[PDB]
């Protein structure tokens, strides 16, 4: 969810 929060 690092990349989920960062990208979306």
């Amino acid at each position, epitope marked *: 969810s690092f*990349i*989920e929060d*960062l990208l*979306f």
Partner: single-chain antibody, 225 residues
């Protein structure tokens, strides 16, 4: 055994369309977000698109907004890029990349030739350099605003896809030699090669994963004399 196999590129007239595919093997495809990154000839890396693990969320760079569509099929372990309304500015090698806090693994890249800000700016210095075997090489990367410690370093051989070298400023990717070190936080970062080797010639890119959109430096080409 991790593999990303791209196909579908080629030559196209302005205004036409192409569909890229990336075939993934060697990891659980549905467990990871996936991106497309492109590189115009003799130019730098530019993030294009990204999609969540299930396909439910997508993101697009402003440059391709409205024209490009990313999708995935987890039952075939395949990532897609539908490119419509193609412009000559879209001319680039396109890579698919497994996306975590960095781009962990890149496909080999497919060429697409089209012929007939509030963003964080990454700047590297120097833009190239030549040094001898055994030399200590230092490269700098500055962000126009703070990126905490989310700074990634990629190594690109001529003609090859980028490989992830260091992520989160100082963490080494598996199998990277200890001669590579990174440091820095906030806005100023450094990559160091303690003892330069002949196989180290490449262009080195930094890239921040602090705030969308993900942005690259313009690269540092390093030659061994």
């Amino acid at each position: 055994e991790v593999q990303l196999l791209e196909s579908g590129g080629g030559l196209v007239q302005p205004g036409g369309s192409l569909r890229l595919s990336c075939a993934a093997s060697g990891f659980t495809f549905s467990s990871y977000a996936m991106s497309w990154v492109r590189q115009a000839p003799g130019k730098g890396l530019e993030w294009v698109s990204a999609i969540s693990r299930q396909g439910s969320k997508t993101a697009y760079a402003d440059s391709v907004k409205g024209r490009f569509t990313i999708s995935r099929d987890n039952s075939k372990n395949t990532l897609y890029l539908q490119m419509n309304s193609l412009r000559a500015e879209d001319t680039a090698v396109y890579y698919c990349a497994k996306t975590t806090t960095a781009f962990d693994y890149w496909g080999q890249g497919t060429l697409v030739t089209v012929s007939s800000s509030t963003d964080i700016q990454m700047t590297q210095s120097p833009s190239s350099l030549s040094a001898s075997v055994g030399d200590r090489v230092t490269i700098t990367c500055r962000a126009s605003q703070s990126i905490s410690s989310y700074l990634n370093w990629y190594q690109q051989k001529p003609g090859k896809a980028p490989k992830l070298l260091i992520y989160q400023a100082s963490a080494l990717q598996s199998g990277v030699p200890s001669r590579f070190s990174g440091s820095g936080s906030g806005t100023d970062f450094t990559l160091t090669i303690s003892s330069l080797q002949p196989e180290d010639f490449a262009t080195y890119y930094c890239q921040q994963s602090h705030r969308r959109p993900l942005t690259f430096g313009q690269g540092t080409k390093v030659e061994i004399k």
